[PDB]
Amino acid sequence: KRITTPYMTKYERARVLGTRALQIAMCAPVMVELEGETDPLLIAMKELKARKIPIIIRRYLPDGSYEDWGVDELIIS
Amino acid sequence: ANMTFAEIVTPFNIDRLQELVRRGNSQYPGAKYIIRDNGDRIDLRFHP
Amino acid sequence: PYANQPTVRITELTDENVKFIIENTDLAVANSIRRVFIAEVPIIAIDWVQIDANSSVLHDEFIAHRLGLIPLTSDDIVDKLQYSRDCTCEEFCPECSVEFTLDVRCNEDQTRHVTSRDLISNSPRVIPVTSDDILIVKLRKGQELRLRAYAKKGFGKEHAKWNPTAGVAFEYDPDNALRHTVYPKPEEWPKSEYSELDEDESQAPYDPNGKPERFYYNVESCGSLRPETIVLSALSGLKKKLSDLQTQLSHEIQS
Amino acid sequence: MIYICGECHTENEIKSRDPIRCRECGYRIMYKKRTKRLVVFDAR
Amino acid sequence: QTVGVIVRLERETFQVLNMYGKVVTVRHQVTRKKDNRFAVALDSEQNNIHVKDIVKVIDGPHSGREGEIRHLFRSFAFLHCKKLVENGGMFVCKTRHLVLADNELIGQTVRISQGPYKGYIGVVKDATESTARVELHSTCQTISVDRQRLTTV
Amino acid sequence: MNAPPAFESFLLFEGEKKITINKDTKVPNACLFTINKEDHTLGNIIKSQLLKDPQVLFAGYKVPHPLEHKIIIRVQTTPDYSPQEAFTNAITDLISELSLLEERFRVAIKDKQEG
Amino acid sequence: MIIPVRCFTCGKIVGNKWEAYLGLLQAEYTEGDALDALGLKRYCCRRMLLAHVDLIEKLLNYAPL
Ligand SMILES: [Zn+2]
Ligand SMILES: [Zn+2]
Ligand SMILES: [Zn+2]
């Protein structure tokens, strides 16, 4: 029962896109079929729209505890 | 021409970045440095 | 579905300027014609300049800039001449250039005037247009000025020194029948030299179905070229540009 | 090399280890002679 | 003609062991050579060997010993060995008796004899195999041109 | 120092085509002619000439940036007519008009000289 | 300092008329009459000779060096 919001904050979007773009730039496997793209940023955005990025967000609650979220679990807006 | 950005070599941009390295600092667009994984900095205005 | 049949009427002809009227034509053609007058009627101007020695009060590039704006009589020679960057030569040759030499040694306490008269071409077909004459620089006793220059084919778009016209007066619809402009108080405005409105009115009645026509031109030459030569070379150059564009478009479509 | 005295225009050569002085005026300002290298100008 | 490796540091001299294997005593004022740590040498069995590589000596006066390469020459290699108490463990053997266990155009007044920049004069700042930078005397810029487009004054 | 070479304001440098064609996908019979190293001199006159033809449903041009020297001309004609055909007919009409104007201007010069 | 070769706006030659403008001023021509005599009608060119200061006369007083 994750009490936090099911939405992706803009900061989470920024960090996950940047990190996955850097991963793709480091010759990582791409969990979506590209369509002739070369920029890691566009490929990361395509994966985000596909909801196919393997990152797990860990939101630290202020009481020291935390919640864990799959990117596909959150609502991408 | 002076200010620069660091692009990581990948199998997609290897051709484009190779051509940029070939051009060097003289022409625009070009490049200044190759940073291999060892950390050695090959400056692209003195080593043809 | 075809271009108009223009008719020409030269109202005034002089060797420094010319005034004419083009009728049965579109506005865009007239605007492009004046643009070609200023921009793409090529002439010959002193461009390349080697200073063998300078001792005037004025630094060198000032003198080179002054020599650049000297007009030159290039009525016929500019056609057979060619652009230097296109011609095959080491630096310069008669097929694409004309050499000039200048050397004045003032050893007289009276003031000296290095003028356009002192320019010495190696071909008499091109000279300074004044040859009173244009002052280039004043010299004192003890001051020399020695140099050799080269003049080459170019047009005004590349640099204004190749601009052959000293101003192109243009007009159309002098009565403002089309009402392309809106005078807030038409009573205040002077009448053009072509306007037929008598001195009790200020605008012709607004013609709805009108179209721009009766384009009045007054082309003033610097004297580097004769005005009729300027207009003829303008039309020739614009035709050349459009023919080249047609050639490239045909090659593109065939490809 | 060759230098011009700043007062009486006396052209004169000066060594690399002698203080400057006009050879006929005693003046103590010298100007370098113009370069003998090819200099060209586009009139633009 | 001969390099040397310091094998003992003293008050006013260096004990230096050379390529010949001869220990000498020299003054403080020998010159420091630029070491080439990426130099490649061949052992006695056509195996590439670099510095810090443990190599056995199968031939030569020091045959039977095994040492770590520390410096290289065209045909010599210096081996360190902690067990050997001689010259701080440093000796030398020939490389074939081991086994692994500026453009002239620069600053030249030039003249563009071909291309859109024809007529002008400049000075070559940088030069390459194909192109060369020229500071243009005429305008307040420097640009690069093919060497074919240049003609020296 | 970054002032451009002005002589490279009208000269095609190497690897540059004078004109290229791109069939726009939004509307049928619509083409975009991108011409390099040109300005309003050809764009305005060609736009007017294309507007003269009734078979040309739409004709216009723009310059994407004044410092650059691309001009992009959009041409749309009826669905029985090529836009390239309209472009070529417009160029031929303009060239014929300017040749006629040259002839008449020479005649007028001679008339004013004798007169 | 020296007279410009051409009017900046329109481009008519003016470098062969400053000395003549001075000479006609010595004839006590009104300045407008002088400029009309030299064929300068558009005020772009009239600005040139009306507003030019010829400092070169004050600069030649020094030594030629
Ligand atoms: Zn030639
Ligand atoms: Zn002296
Ligand atoms: Zn003016």
Task: Describe the protein.
- This is part of a larger assembly, with 7 protein chains of 7 kinds.
- With 77 residues, chain A is of the alpha+beta class.
- Helices cover 35% and strands 13% of the residues of chain A.
- Chain A has one domain: Eukaryotic RPB6 RNA polymerase subunit, CATH 3.90.940.10.
- In chain A, strands 1-2 form a two-stranded antiparallel sheet.
- In chain A, helix 1 (10-25) packs across helix 2.
- With 48 residues, chain B is of the alpha+beta class.
- In chain B, 21% of the residues lie in helices and 12% in strands.
- Chain B has one helix at residues 14-23, and strands at residues 33-35, 41-43.
- In chain B, strands 1-2 form a two-stranded antiparallel ribbon.
- In chain B, strand 1 (33-35) and strand 2 form a beta hairpin.
- Chain B is globular.
- The two termini of chain B are 19 Å apart.
- By secondary structure, chain D is mainly beta.
- Helix content of chain D is 0%, strand content 30%.
- Chain D is elongated and about 45 Å long.
- In chain E, a hairpin with a 3-residue loop joins strand 1 and strand 2 (13-18).
- The interface between C and F is large, with 45 and 48 residues.
- One zinc ion (ZN) is lined by residues 87-89, 93, 95-96 of chain C.
- The site of one zinc ion has 8 residues of chain G, from helix 3.
- Chain G: One of its GO terms (molecular function) is DNA binding.
- Chain G: It comes from Sus scrofa (Pig).
- Chain G: InterPro entries: RNA_pol_su_RPB10, RNA_pol_suN_Zn-BS, RPABC5/Rpb10.
- Chain G: Pfam families: RNA_pol_N (PF01194).
Short description:
Chain B is of the alpha+beta class. Helices cover 21% and strands 12% of the residues of chain B. Chain B contains one helix and two strands.
> What fraction, in percent, of the residue positions of chain G are helical?
40-55%
Oligomer: part of a larger assembly
Question: How would the global form of chain G be characterised?
Answer: globular
Rg of chain B, Å, rounded: 10 Å
Give helix and strand order of chain G, one letter per element, not per position.
HHHH
Name every ligand kind in the structure.
Answer: zinc ion
Distance between the termini of chain B: 19 Å
* Classification by helices and strands of chain G: mainly alpha
Number of discrete domains of chain G: 1
Overall form of chain B: globular
Strand order of the largest sheet of chain B: 1-2
CATH class of chain G: Mainly Alpha
Structural class category of chain B: alpha+beta
CATH superfamily of chain G: Homeodomain-like
Biggest chain-to-chain interface with counts:
C-F, 45 and 48 residues
Instruction: Assign a percent range to the helix content of chain B.
Output: 10-25%
N- to C-terminal separation of chain G? 20 Å
Beta content of chain B: 5-15%
Binding site for RNA (chain E): 34
Protein name (chain E): Transcription elongation factor SPT5
Family (chain E): Belongs to the SPT5 family.
Binding site for DNA (chain E): 74
Main traits of this protein?
part of a larger assembly, 7 chains, B: 48 residues, alpha+beta, 2 strands, 21% helix, E: 153 residues, mainly beta, five-stranded antiparallel sheet, 15 strands, binds zinc ion, transcription/dna/rna, Nucleic acids, transcription
